[PDB]
Amino acid sequence: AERISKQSTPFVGAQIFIEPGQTQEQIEQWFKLLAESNMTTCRIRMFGKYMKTPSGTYDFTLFDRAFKLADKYHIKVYATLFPDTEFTDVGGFKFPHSREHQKEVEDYIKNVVSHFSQYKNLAAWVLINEPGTPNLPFNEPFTKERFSDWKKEHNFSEYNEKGYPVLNFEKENFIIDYHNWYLNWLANQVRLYDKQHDLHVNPHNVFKLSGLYDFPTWRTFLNSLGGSAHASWHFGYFPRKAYTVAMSANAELIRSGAGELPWLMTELQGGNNLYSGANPLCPTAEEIIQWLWINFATEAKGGIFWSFNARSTAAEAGEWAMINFKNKSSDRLIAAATIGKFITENVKMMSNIKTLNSGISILYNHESMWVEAAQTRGKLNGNGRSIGAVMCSPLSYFEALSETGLQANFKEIKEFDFSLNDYTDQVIILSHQIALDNKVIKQLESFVEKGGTLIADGLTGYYDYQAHSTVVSGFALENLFGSYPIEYKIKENLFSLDFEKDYKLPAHLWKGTIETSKATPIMDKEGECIACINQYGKGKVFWIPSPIALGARESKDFSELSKLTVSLLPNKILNDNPHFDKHYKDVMMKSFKSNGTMYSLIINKSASVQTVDIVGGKGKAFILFANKNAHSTANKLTISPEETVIIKWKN
Amino acid sequence: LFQGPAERISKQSTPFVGAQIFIEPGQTQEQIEQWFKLLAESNMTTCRIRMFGKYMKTPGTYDFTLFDRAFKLADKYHIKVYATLFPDTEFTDVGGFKFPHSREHQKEVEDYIKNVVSHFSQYKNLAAWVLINEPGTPNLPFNEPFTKERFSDWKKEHNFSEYNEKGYPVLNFEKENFIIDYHNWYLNWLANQVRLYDKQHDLHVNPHNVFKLSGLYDFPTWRTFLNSLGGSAHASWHFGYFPRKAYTVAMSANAELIRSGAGELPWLMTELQGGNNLYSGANPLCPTAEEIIQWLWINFATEAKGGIFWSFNARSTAAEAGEWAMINFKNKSSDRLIAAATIGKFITENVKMMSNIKTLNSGISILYNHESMWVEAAQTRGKLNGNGRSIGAVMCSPLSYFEALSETGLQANFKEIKEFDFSLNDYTDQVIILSHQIALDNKVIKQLESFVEKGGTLIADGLTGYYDYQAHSTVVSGFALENLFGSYPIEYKIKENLFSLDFEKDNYKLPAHLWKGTIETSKATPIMDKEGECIACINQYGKGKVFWIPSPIALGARESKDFSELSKLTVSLLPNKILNDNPHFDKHYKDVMMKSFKSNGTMYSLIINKSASVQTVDIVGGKGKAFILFANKNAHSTANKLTISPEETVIIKWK
Amino acid sequence: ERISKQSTPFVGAQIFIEPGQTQEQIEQWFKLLAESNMTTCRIRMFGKYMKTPSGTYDFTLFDRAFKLADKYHIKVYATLFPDTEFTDVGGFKFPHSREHQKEVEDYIKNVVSHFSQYKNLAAWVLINEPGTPNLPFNEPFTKERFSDWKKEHNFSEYNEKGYPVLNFEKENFIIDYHNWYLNWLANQVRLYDKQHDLHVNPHNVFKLSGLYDFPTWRTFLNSLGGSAHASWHFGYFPRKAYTVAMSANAELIRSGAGELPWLMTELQGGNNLYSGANPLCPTAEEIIQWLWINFATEAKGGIFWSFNARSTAAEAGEWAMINFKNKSSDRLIAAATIGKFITENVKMMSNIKTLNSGISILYNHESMWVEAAQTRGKLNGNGRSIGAVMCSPLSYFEALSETGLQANFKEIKEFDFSLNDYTDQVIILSHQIALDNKVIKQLESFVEKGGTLIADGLTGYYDYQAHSTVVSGFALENLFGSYPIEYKIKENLFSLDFEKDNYKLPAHLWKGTIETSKATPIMDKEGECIACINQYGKGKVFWIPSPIALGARESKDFSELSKLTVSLLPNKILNDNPHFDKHYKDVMMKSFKSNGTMYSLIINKSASVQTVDIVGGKGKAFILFANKNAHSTANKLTISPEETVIIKWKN
Ligand SMILES: *[C@H]1[C@H]([NH3+])[C@H](CO)[C@@H](O)[C@H](O)[C@@H]1O
Ligand SMILES: *[C@H]1[C@H]([NH3+])[C@H](CO)[C@@H](O)[C@H](O)[C@@H]1O
Ligand SMILES: *[C@H]1[C@H]([NH3+])[C@H](CO)[C@@H](O)[C@H](O)[C@@H]1O
């Protein structure tokens, strides 16, 4: 069996939806067109329901038929373990209902892995479709008992070391461990019967569910990390014109979770929402090209569209499909096929992509999300006093950097390597990460001391991991920030921070004021201290405790956040990295390397032709890919609305 | 002419204006008599009385005194009585329970019916038993043991497979099919209970909120045990899909829907809004005098044998205290009772005309089906965002065609598909509109094929035929309507709530809602858009034609608040016979309606102006010269050009 | 000291005591509290922070605070707060069970026996914020109480005339239950301490007044308190009208107090981060506005929640008057100027008596209870929603404030109907939809003896059993000399245009038409009778059954309601009371006396400097207090935006 690696040739693929009632002739027609569309790979939901016989035997006929047709057309198969469940359960159950249900899942895995492991075109086992749920079944006896046991095996005090009352977030910490346990158990079950094939899983809705996911632990039992990134389900924090930024951030978040493992996008939106989806659309041909290039530029080893063909009955009947109702190519399949073709014509380049890390890392942590949920009491008013602000804030910095043509990592804090001796020319952005503990503050102190630049806005560091505010009891970040908070004063959803001898930064909801000791104060036109720069060892801290990233989001203008961030970056980042000479609204660029050669991905999401002046790095623009005849004069790229451009930098 | 001295309602009965007389303890003889006196002097012949079990129960005997007093005063003033069976229930239960709570409760209802029917059947002024007030509820009591057991029994008596004949997974809509049968069962049982003690009087029932609850109602089965079909059509409860200026269209569609359900049975509007919402109602108003006249004429023009207003007098305590009443707090006439009285007077002065009304059927039938509503509910997961991806699109779509036709002065039927007669040999000059009827089975497609083959015109827009009755999409597995449509769907692509379909020829633009459908023609003639995609087709099929446009253009007209393009398109697809034989407008008129009817050979037209300004409407088609028989604001006509004032109702007699 | 109507008013603040705080921080709070001219603190006596493992009480944490309060001559309001979940911010309102009642008995024994011994104990607060909309009917203690209460009451389903009735068993039980538990808490405290003032702080009074029988509470209290938080309680008002909100809240508590002194136990001292329904940070200007409105309305104190902040989870670092360095915000500096003013004007400030104009705006429990039943709990902010029966009188109150006229705001049972003369007294019953025969007789007596009655909206539509006499035989026909004909629903906003071409009154939702017998009809331009004046004995009735107060609210314009009301007032009120020569949008004035000397409080909440012409009473304006250099020429006051002015009337 071929094992996926960081050197694998990336593929374009699609879900092949198999259910009873389909004919041999239609299934073969799908695989034939899939092969002719320069797609190498399919994914198949191995429905327990469509293998169970009245007598309790497994009948594999329906899936044998699909596997054999895949083999005939040289299509490899991601096989999703999907035990028997209600027809109306679109996504699948996330945990066993009971010990008896766990034994049924054991029996399902034994039967399905023993049989289908024998196919030479099996590429991977997907352990579970879309692990993680917002609504965890605490009512079910399996989960209820696990939670009880877990609580008794942990020693939690109602008071901290200094004697203050604490929250311990038992539920949230259990949920991490519970996901870790069940996925690890699924991996172990598959490994009883098959030690040959890649294990894969697709975390989903990552801007909401990242607080469920311990990706470092998952690396211990996976061969690749996947992802669902559906424009109609997962990008609600963005307008459609910014699904570029959404896909880029989703790619960076999975990339970070993957660490040393290769990653691929297991599930992308391939077609139309009729009745399904939260933010329904039909992806344009242009969007299909944009999403594949963003993922490959971000080291994805694959892009699998849900779906090639449609479900026939009830939920998503005739929805999501890349083929039309005559089983011929939509403009979406035609577009995906040009990327498959491009890969086969540029194998060495496409097989060795490494994202050009600017040195900027935007960090989020589970605990800021958990404290936000407790403090907002689950309010959904889309603002700082609602669930989502601790993710929308870093996503806004990410967007501002994208509109500057700068790559940024998007990482959980435990995925950042704090063990290096030098962080010269490395930048951490902590945007409204409202919960930081002593351990992480010490890591941040080390990082800055050794040359790191730390940018902190919003209520970053207001609470610890027990929702205790050191801002009240004795500020844990006083040392690093060389300053102390004075007040937060709530304002409108959108106000202006007007710096002395003007920046006018858009700010959201709260004005923070500080007192500097070691730091240099920055004053506003009202004579209040609203920010500071602390020189700490070899590094610097910029602290502005008003939410200026959420301000940029609220004002729908990232230009001031771009200019401010650029002015704080070490010169080395601006000299070594291709970026825009200025901020461009609704334009993104990210750069990658493949065997020594540097490339740039440019996408224009504005309503008009843009001329983007690319500066930094070395080389002359050669246009390798452009779906609307983009042209460059020196390093000035003229790019049409919705166009995707790959520049190869020659020399 | 054997089972009763009781007058039995017929399609030949003289229509009446009437009102609820609300009877509760605490009222005096003097006030009740004053109500019946004024009711009689307002040219009303009929009242309806809720026979509250609560106000007859003694510390277990029945005391009938409170209702005897009302029946005797009704009799004294020659007022006939619709008596509503309303068993004992909480004072706070405004509308009444819809089903027994338990086997023990069913026995209490049996005892209630025995006592009340045995006693009040003896009054010579009893016109009808209303079996239940407003059968049907959105929120069915599945948690109560009587319903839970009935559902369990019904499930064990039905054999459902999880797969169809081709092997595909299916939904079976057990809940929805049970609910139809459960309503059928309980109403039939109520009819049987009444018939144990009285075989002389008309059985009546008033289905309500029909644009939402039609999926609960099997009117063909109800005909089996009713003598007349009723209806509640309240401007404050039932017309949420319409602005107030289109309550004319709402009432006309509600009348057509009940008319269709009635079939051979006479029908009447059991419950119309007679007065003011204080705290009650979803879309509160006080009907204008003009609105009262509009609603009575729309119903009579649509073959109603009665209009009964809720209410003559008001409830006194809590819910709807001093609300809904046609009389003011001094028990004298509001402008609403004075207006209703002019229609009562008109009827007594034109008995033969008013007793024999038959709606002039244009030949256009707008069809809805239970199953499109049920599949919509499952697919939209009960979303209430008032659009294609919400509950109500499958009804708002046909209602939009209906509105477009009303603004063209054309009658259209509004019928459940099982109420349409598919058994005829000729459908020349007949038109079916299937607007966003997303669920169609093989049986109905065969009926539609027969209909078109024999000369029928089929107009289909939106996602009509996307699913079958098991929510299986033949669009995915093998399109069941390919033969009839002479074409095949290619894609739906979601767009904004309002977009334009830009036709390749003639620079022609249709408002469309939410989804753009593209097709491939085989036998049909393709119609292309400016982007070179096929968006519609005309299939010639035997003697008939099919127009198919799988974008929602009716919902597009609704979203744009403009039915003028939908009017022009529909008119251009009608057989010439419909335009030549039927009075209609020479063009589309925004916020004007006309419907025509016949009575013993003579043709009439009803015209209502709901616009802000005086309109001159050019009436064309049929034969005759306009004579203005009824006009509440001095309408005048020159030849067949009618000048009609805002909120005016006009009846033209064609000489 | 025992509090009296002659006590010197104080400024004070909550001192929030929890484990983890140091001696040094607590002392620093009391030191700054003393230096801020604050004499009083309030301390939550958390049962949780006195319970030891063994069930003994350890008082150490509160001893430390009491002793530091004593050292700085700070008196203490001690709040009885039994053991409860850390997450319970406001405290439980009733015992959970008979066993929990015994724990509360033991808590009171231990805490009152111990802390009664401190010489700086000013008051026991029996319970923090009595009243909850949602009573725990599920819990056995409340379930049994309701069962017992129901068996002790005989309710008939019909009235005397035979009509069906509602009896509001739940609402009547809830009044009696609050009466019972507070009385029981008072009796428990009195078992161990007969020396100290008993106090309680009713809250959210514009919503919870239907829970509160203040006349009964007088029997076991020495003072009535109040929570009046801008972020929780003033939802019916924009921020620019929090002056009117505080004035109405002060009047409502003052009325409940009767002969008892009252003080505002809980005012907003600082910032909402995540807490509050209508979040803000009070301005310095707002702090001064609220203290003066309360003192002008006879308050013996203003206690801010809070001096210092909670440290963990709910309201962590929120509400505090001190900043995170434990120094003065502009809010503490502002509060300190009022403390200083009091020490420099002891005799004036100790003897304040509100100058009663003679205008009383009456609300009743029963209008609120019938509204809840008729609106079925709808929250659409209009006549068909919960809150109209309170927003309506609050709108008259606002119109009178913008005329510079004091008005009482009273529950109908708090109005003295037993006098022989009501010459030059005015009652406004605005949309008080429920009136019984007893109250109609009191209103007949009041008008007969010279009273002026103003009734708008659906006043008197129902009786106390939600039976409408408008339908069965109008109970107010005699007093009104007229009969309702119809209500007709209209738009949210329409105009009642009087035929005499004077008044064009904004009206909300319903147009009422009437038939006059004894009364003089007032016709509108459409030829309908919309109002009347009835001469009844020596008094007059103005009846307009359209909601013109809710009309003024909906139009955000109280000017026509002001002019109409002024034209109906007895001459004596206009001659004897300082008021404005005309209506001033977003300006308030209320007047008070201290011994013989008359004063006026003027606040400008408009965006611009106003010149207000004060007329009525006697004297020349001398500016005693002004925080933005107000000046007067004769009796014309020039007052800046957000400025508070006290005028002393010299002669
Ligand atoms: C992912 C995605 N959610 C599809 C479209 O909603 C769904 O049908 C499948 O269950 C995939 O897991
Ligand atoms: C019909 C209608 N719902 C009336 C107004 O709400 C009501 O009083 C009656 O109970 C009928 O339900
Ligand atoms: C009063 C007020 N509700 C405070 C602020 O929300 C709260 O912390 C206190 O518990 C008091 O209830």
Ligand SMILES: [Cl-]
């Ligand atoms: Cl899958």
Ligand SMILES: [Cl-]
């Ligand atoms: Cl009835």
Ligand SMILES: [Cl-]
């Ligand atoms: Cl307290």
